[PDB]
Amino acid sequence: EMQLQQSGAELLRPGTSVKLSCKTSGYIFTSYWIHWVKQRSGQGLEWIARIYPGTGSTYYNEKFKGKATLTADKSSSTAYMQLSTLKSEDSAVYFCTRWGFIPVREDYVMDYWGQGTLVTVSSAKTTAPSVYPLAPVCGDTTGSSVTLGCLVKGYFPEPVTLTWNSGSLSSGVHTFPAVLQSDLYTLSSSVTVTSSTWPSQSITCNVAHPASSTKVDKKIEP
Amino acid sequence: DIVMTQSPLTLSVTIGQPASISCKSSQSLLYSNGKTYLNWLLQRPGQSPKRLIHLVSKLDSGVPDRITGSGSGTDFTLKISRVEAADLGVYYCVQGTHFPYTFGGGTKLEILRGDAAPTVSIFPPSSEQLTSGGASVVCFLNNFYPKDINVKWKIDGSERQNGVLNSWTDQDSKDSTYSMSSTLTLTKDEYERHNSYTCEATHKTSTSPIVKSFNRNEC
Ligand SMILES: O=[N+]([O-])c1ccc(CO)cc1
Numbered sequence: 489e490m491q492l493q494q495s496g497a498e499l500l501r502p503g504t505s506v507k508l509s510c511k512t513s514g515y516i517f518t519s520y521w522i523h524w525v526k527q528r529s530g531q532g533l534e535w536i537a538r539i540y541p542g543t544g545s546t547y548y549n550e551k552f553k554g555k556a557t558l559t560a561d562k563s564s565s566t567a568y569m570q571l572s573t574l575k576s577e578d579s580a581v582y583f584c585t586r587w588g589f590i591p592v593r594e595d596y597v598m599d600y601w602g603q604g605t606l607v608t609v610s611s612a613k614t615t616a617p618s619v620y621p622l623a624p625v626c627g628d629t630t631g632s633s634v635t636l637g638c639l640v641k642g643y644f645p646e647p648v649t650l651t652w653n654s655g656s657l658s659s660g661v662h663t664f665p666a667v668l669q670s671d672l673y674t675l676s677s678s679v680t681v682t683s684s685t686w687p688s689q690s691i692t693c694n695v696a697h698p699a700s701s702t703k704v705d706k707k708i709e710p
Numbered sequence: 711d712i713v714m715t716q717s718p719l720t721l722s723v724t725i726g727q728p729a730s731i732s733c734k735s736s737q738s739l740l741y742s743n744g745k746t747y748l749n750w751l752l753q754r755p756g757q758s759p760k761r762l763i764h765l766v767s768k769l770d771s772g773v774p775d776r777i778t779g780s781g782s783g784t785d786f787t788l789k790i791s792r793v794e795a796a797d798l799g800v801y802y803c804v805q806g807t808h809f810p811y812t813f814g815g816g817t818k819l820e821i822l823r824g825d826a827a828p829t830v831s832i833f834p835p836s837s838e839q840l841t842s843g844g845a846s847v848v849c850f851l852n853n854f855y856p857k858d859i860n861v862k863w864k865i866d867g868s869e870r871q872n873g874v875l876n877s878w879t880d881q882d883s884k885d886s887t888y889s890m891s892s893t894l895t896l897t898k899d900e901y902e903r904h905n906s907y908t909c910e911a912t913h914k915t916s917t918s919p920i921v922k923s924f925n926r927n928e929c
Pocket residue numbers: 523524525535585587747749804805806807811
């Protein structure tokens with residue numbers, strides 16, 4: 489089991505620098521090239537650079553010379569990418585990947601990818617979210633089934649973690665992508681259950697905002 | 711740098727039918743060693759990209775042979791012989807013949823299914839929120855198809871355009887439907903000055919607007 493684990497989301501101030509890490513396991517780290525790729529606003533990928541950890545040899549896309557510096561620590565099987573003097577265009581998700589092309593064979597081995605690291609370049613302050621329970625009035629769906637909701641608003645920056653009944657309730661839940669407005673994000677989630685489950689047994693919304701060390705559970709009461 | 715052009719931008723196909731994606735490059739991708747380094751990747755919703763094909767037509771291990779690749783020079787095509795639900799996502803062609811490596815813009819593949827009418831739920835502000843001096847009215851429009859839908863808020867019969875925040879999910883891989891959330895935020899004081907709050911939608915599944923509303927009051 490070959491695995492690449494990347495570091496967590498970063499909020500960086502304009503003009504500063506960040507070092508992203510990509511820890512690997514399950515294969516001989518020094519024998520394969522590690523590439524870094526950038527993704528902005530969904531479909532929009534760009535190739536940054538590649539490094540051969542065995543020798544330290546690196547090749548950069550001209551656009552990123554001076555922006556990105558790749559290193560790799562053989563003793564820990566970790567590749568790093570430092571980004572310097574961050575600006576608007578640098579806000580993106582960055583992926584590391586053991587791409588798998590073997591130059592000597594002129595053929596490919598399976599590609600393995602890290603989960604991605606989201607970098608947000610902003611000077612806006614970190615704000616904890618307010619979590620509000622949404623109990624039905626008309627959005628009761630009548631009988632048979634009923635839908636409840638959870639409103640998470642006024643936080644910065646992304647992301648927030650939202651579950652229902654500690655993750656025990658995953659079927660019929662819809663979590664909507666957060667939307668930014670006036671320097672604060674708002675996110676919502678709905679869960680549909682049978683009229684027999686709720687209000688009988690309790691339904692709770694669990695929310696976590698790492699950036700502000702906030703963890704809150706809201707019980708949807710009638 | 712080589713410019714990679716993909717078409718179409720989006721394709722909607724029913725499970726079981728074939729689908730083909732095109733990719734064109736600004737320079738021939740034939741390398742001086744006679745090999746053509748053209749790859750196809752798929753990025754499933756909420757996932758990292760994954761290579762499906764390399765060297766124009768060679769499938770990567772673990773990739774179903776329902777997927778086929780072909781082309782040469784500056785024209786390439788990815789074909790899916792029979793579409794399955796797991797094929798939903800964005801497909802990209804990427805070239806490694808010329809430095810630096812460049813990607814195409816992507817083609818989103820969406821599963822075409824039978825029209826589904828939205829299930830709409832409306833929620834008045836919570837006590838917790840009102841205490842803070844704010845009031846948000848939320849409306850969920852769940853499980854509809856096609857994605858195309860228009861929602862308007864009306865307070866006491868008049869349309870309200872300021873203070874509306876909308877969000878949509880990507881196509882659901884369990885039923886191929888879409889869901890959306892619309893939130894209207896007002897001050898507590900203004901919220902307490904009106905009576906009827908209406909969430910109104912326009913969708914292919916109906917010749918008249920789809921409505922959900924509530925009248926606030928007290929008792
Ligand atoms: O995404 N990657 O890591 C890539 C690496 C190399 C190429 C050139 O074929 C394309 C993509």
